[PDB]
Amino acid sequence: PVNPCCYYPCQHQGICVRFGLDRYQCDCTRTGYSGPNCTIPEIWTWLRTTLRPSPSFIHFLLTHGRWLWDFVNATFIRDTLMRLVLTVRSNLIPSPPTYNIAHDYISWESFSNVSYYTRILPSVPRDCPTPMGTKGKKQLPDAEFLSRRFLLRRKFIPDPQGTNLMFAFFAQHFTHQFFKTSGKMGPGFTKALGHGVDLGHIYGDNLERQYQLRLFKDGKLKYQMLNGEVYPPSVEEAPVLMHYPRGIPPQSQMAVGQEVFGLLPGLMLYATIWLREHNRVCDLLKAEHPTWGDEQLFQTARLILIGETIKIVIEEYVQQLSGYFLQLKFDPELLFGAQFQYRNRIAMEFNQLYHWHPLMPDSFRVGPQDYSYEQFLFNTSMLVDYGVEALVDAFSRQPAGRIGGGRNIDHHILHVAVDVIKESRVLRLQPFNEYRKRFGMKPYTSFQELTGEKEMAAELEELYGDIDALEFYPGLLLEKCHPNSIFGESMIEMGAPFSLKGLLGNPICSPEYWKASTFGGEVGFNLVKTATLKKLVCLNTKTCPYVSFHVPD
Amino acid sequence: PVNPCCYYPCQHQGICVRFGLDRYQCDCTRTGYSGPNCTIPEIWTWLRTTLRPSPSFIHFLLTHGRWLWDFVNATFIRDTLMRLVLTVRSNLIPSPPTYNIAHDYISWESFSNVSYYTRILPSVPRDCPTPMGTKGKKQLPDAEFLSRRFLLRRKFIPDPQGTNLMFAFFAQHFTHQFFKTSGKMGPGFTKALGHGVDLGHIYGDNLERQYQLRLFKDGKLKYQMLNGEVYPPSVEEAPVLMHYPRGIPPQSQMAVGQEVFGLLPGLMLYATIWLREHNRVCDLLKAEHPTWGDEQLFQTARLILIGETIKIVIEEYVQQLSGYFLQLKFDPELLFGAQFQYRNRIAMEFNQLYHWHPLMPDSFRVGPQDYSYEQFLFNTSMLVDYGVEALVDAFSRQPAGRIGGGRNIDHHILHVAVDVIKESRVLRLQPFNEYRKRFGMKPYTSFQELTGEKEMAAELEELYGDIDALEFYPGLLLEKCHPNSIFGESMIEMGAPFSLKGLLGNPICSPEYWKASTFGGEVGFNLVKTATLKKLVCLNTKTCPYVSFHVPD
Ligand code: HEM
Ligand code: HEM
Ligand SMILES: Cc1ccc(-c2cc(C(F)(F)F)nn2-c2ccc(S(N)(=O)=O)cc2)cc1
Ligand SMILES: Cc1ccc(-c2cc(C(F)(F)F)nn2-c2ccc(S(N)(=O)=O)cc2)cc1
Ligand SMILES: CCCCCCCCOC1O[C@H](CO)[C@@H](O)[C@H](O)[C@H]1O
Ligand SMILES: CCCCCCCCO[C@@H]1O[C@H](CO)[C@@H](O)[C@H](O)[C@H]1O
Ligand SMILES: CCCCCCCCO[C@@H]1O[C@H](CO)[C@@H](O)[C@H](O)[C@H]1O
Ligand SMILES: CCCCCCCCO[C@@H]1O[C@H](CO)[C@@H](O)[C@H](O)[C@H]1O
């Protein structure tokens, strides 16, 4: 009595429920389809799919015809296409979340419990013949061998788009505020209950820790003065839990919101940048409101930083990644006339695919000197030895590593790539083609169609056996890319939805929160509308270095 | 240097922010008004208010013209008017939430922190001349004296609507799942973090307690067999925290989700009803899915009960209370084409006004025998001595007490009425007329306009002094009512919004959760669509008594 739902019968986001001893049914409610499987099109959906261009065809448009986009950008079409990218990508990702590691069905414990990582698709029944449902071999390839043959870096393959390490560290820094898989509770759980841009990696992840980081005067945060410059406080001044190595001295270890940030001068660099940005905002709010107290000056400055984050993440961060000629625009008012939920729940496949370790180089250049992985990791003095302005100049002048296609993952951080595929099997993620179906994409018929070449494709036909049994994480990294893209179709087509929901799904974007008084007048509401990666750095420094998400070139 | 925001300048939901030493400004963003105070109408809003009938005029329509509503009910207009009541009413309620006891401004702590009771309006700055802003006497009336002169019951004044005690106990039972003001954290905090219909008073309020209440087989809940009937388990069987009297003599103390439920046979009666309803649903789900396990059978049956609750709360509970000829209809699909947030946050004024102790009679009739407050409170054996069917028959045959107008609060429960007005001053709620402005109502110019008579009205002119300084809670109960109504115009026009937002704001109503598979096929999705107060009782009993929200008459 083989579980009928192991064949993934339900198509187009159909929920498969089990009936009787060996029966089943598919709920085709509002999926645009009917019938036993939700395959037979409705009158309107049939017309919509017939006039639907391939995802790659629309990517070609958004990456070609400069002249056309010089016009579109300077017209109201920048909003007709922006709102279209927003609503359409983010549709109904389910909102309110739908599953988690413990449940493969809509439940109140899944919507109420935040300590869970939601999941767009259910897991593969523990009662299914093969590990990935019905297709593939009885055993899946060795995680270590997959990383030493298809993910291991031989020669450095830079990003064709020019992306630099300044972007690489902004990604790891801004992404770790909603990715805190908890050791204790194990995989499928998170410590960052913000599940979005709550700047928990600056103040969070909890309140008890927040106060320890706050100076409690002028709504500022405690700090430390080294070489007449501003950095985070020493753990002595502000005693909070940090995952520093050793050992070490307490006087030389800075404290922030997100831990494991002291294990990289890059993450502590942005911890210093946003720190000076918070206190600077408190100086602007104190002058405007002498009557305001400590609590209001802080919690207000926090909303101002959260606004500057999304502003730089859309109009800058995704603009370098995207490579499009369409100027991405952060304007919450685009979905003010749309049926949109201002809620967000971090998925386990968003945490899964966001492991962009290929971005890390072979080493780390800093002007004349060159530090290796051994000299750069767990560095305590490097941050204060070079300063902020001199360091931001180095990262912006060094290219990062291409994420898609492979094989481009340094041998140092490859142990994470294996702990990601290992965590994939623990969560029991579905195959690669099943997720392709979920994000409006046609499944690959062969391994050669995935990589675009015969050599690895054949080396995979031996391991997995079937294409419908290919793993999720390995599928994204081994997929070929468009001519000068940073990663495969699937990384774009699956990642775009998740991030767009989480940005505009933020409370501040809603009609209730997107006022001028919410940021303490027009002064604070302008800082958000003019937020730039260049002003986030230079305004807090003395000298103005080279700051960008792409190398000079 | 008087705080300018103490005059409540901002009109029509305008946010007042303080500037300089003695200045201020009003944020008129999307309030439909502009100018210094948001008083000048916009082109469209001016036309909307000109064609806006008084709330009492629309009340009159919804309570008259029987012939017209016999037609409307049997037409698609039941949906045109239902959706209209939904969207319009619930749009007065901010979402996401706005403020809480600790903050008088939009902040991330206020949206992230759930242990808070949100609040529709900010508090009265402690740096204001008079306790209620600028109007009124330097001191507010004695809480005890107000309850002994305007709330104390002399002669029993029944509800003109026929409402009975069956409704009175369904109100206190269904309302205490989102009202758990924490005694530890003090006023302005809640233990029920569900902030809605999470049936936390059955399973909740937490997970550790939930397992203790569950049998862990067939997704059922532990129980106890007394006289061949089904009741909740003894604490011995299921050890959970309960607030039974001191040195109370268990065995015989039943355990449920919501505590302080053993202090009333009425609350333990509904704890038994919903208990048999959960296990019965598990029998229907087990037959349909023999393969299903314990976890899925329970968490699914939980969504089925949550659905039956809102179904009975709209088409039955608010039917009685409203006494409108318009058949209220629970259909989540009404706001599927509306800009609605499926989120909810319990306000402190919703907790405030929902104190309907006037509903409690002088005594409690049970067929032949009559028990007083001393014989009925903290009763442990009464529940199992009469059974379920014999008791539901008694409550449905006894009228309750009218809530509005006063003075109709038994001398036994009057100590709560004083602890509600006392909690009002702790939270620093705004005056009565200020909240009237918030919920689309014109402020009262005199105390005589509130009560509708000269005798109390004068006694109040002496105490409060000004009408703009009248307290919130006392304002609702002392307000006259339309002759056959259960409470004043303000109780309707402020409670209707809160209630409606929390019912359809529930996740299950959303487009993602409102499927048939979410309830385990059509079987479970039908139990929700045909949920009745009569089927909730009779189906779980042997004999069928008189069950309703109104006396026989
Ligand atoms: C020197 C560079 C880096 C090092 C040493 C590093 C180290 C690690 C380690 C040890 C883990 C543990 C995963 C596991 O135990 O399964 C991890 C996971 C992760 N990596 Fe990195 N990483 C680096 C760069 C990056 C970058 C550039 C990104 C960009 C997005 C990134 C994204 C993530 C995320 C989101 C997780 C999981 C977060 C969580 O579960 O809390 N990492 N990394
Ligand atoms: C015999 C009947 C009742 C008894 C003995 C009772 C008892 C109490 C007591 C002692 C409090 C403490 C409140 C304070 O200290 O300020 C309370 C709170 C409250 N009561 Fe009742 N009550 C009864 C009926 C009702 C009814 C019929 C309703 C609504 C229909 C109601 C609604 C509330 C609400 C909303 C609170 C707020 C407490 C919280 O937020 O946890 N009560 N009750
Ligand atoms: C994780 C993730 C995935 C996709 C996106 C995204 C969003 C958008 C936009 F425009 F919709 F905002 N584009 N866009 C995107 C599009 C193409 C590329 S590429 N270089 O791989 O071809 C890179 C990014 C962002 C984040
Ligand atoms: C706390 C509270 C307050 C109002 C309502 C409500 C909702 C509705 C409806 F129809 F919109 F659903 N009516 N309605 C209502 C209307 C009038 C009265 S009455 N007894 O003063 O005439 C009683 C109830 C419900 C709960
Ligand atoms: C199904 C009845 C539609 C109206 C008659 C038009 C001809 C049938 O329309 C069709 O229906 C199929 C359904 O899968 C479509 O896929 C095809 O276009 C066609 O066979
Ligand atoms: C001209 C481009 C404006 C429209 C933006 C289309 C968004 C990308 O395109 C579409 O995205 C949808 C969301 O992933 C998916 O249904 C499709 O697979 C994809 O093509
Ligand atoms: C026609 C709609 C706008 C004008 C309002 C007319 C009603 C005046 O207002 C209302 O009239 C009701 C009449 O039944 C009275 O019962 C209400 O108390 C009265 O306030
Ligand atoms: C048929 C009678 C009117 C029902 C449709 C209109 C919706 C009624 O809801 C209306 O809400 C407004 C704002 O919440 C209030 O000011 C009105 O008094 C209230 O009746």
What small molecules does the structure contain? protoporphyrin IX containing FE, ligand CEL, octyl beta-D-glucopyranoside
DSSP, total strands of chain A: 10
In whole angstroms, the N-to-C terminal distance of chain A is 62 Å
Q: What is the oligomer described by this structure?
A: homodimer
Please report which band the strand proportion of chain A falls in: under 5%, 5-15%, 15-25%, 25-35%, 35-45% or over 45%.
5-15%
Number of helices of chain A: 22
Spatially, the strands of the biggest sheet of chain A line up as: 1-2
Specify the structural class of chain A.
mainly alpha
* Shape by Cα distribution of chain A: globular
What share of the residues of chain A lie within helices?
Answer: 25-40%
- Profile the largest sheet of chain A: 2 strands, antiparallel
Give the second-level CATH assignment, the architecture of the largest domain in chain A: Orthogonal Bundle
Say what the CATH topology of the largest domain in chain A is: Myeloperoxidase, subunit C
Count of domains of chain A: 2
CATH superfamily of the largest domain in chain A: Haem peroxidase domain superfamily, animal type
> Which pair of protein chains has the largest interface, and what are the residue counts?
A-B, 58 and 56 residues
CATH class of the largest domain in chain A: Mainly Alpha
Radius of gyration of chain A: 24 Å
PDB class: oxidoreductase
Keywords: cox-1, cyclooxygenase, peroxidase, prostaglandin, celecoxib, merohedral twinned, Dioxygenase, Disulfide bond, EGF-like domain, Endoplasmic reticulum, Fatty acid biosynthesis, Glycoprotein, Iron, Lipid synthesis
Assembly: dimeric
Entry title: Crystal Structure of Cyclooxygenase-1 in complex with celecoxib
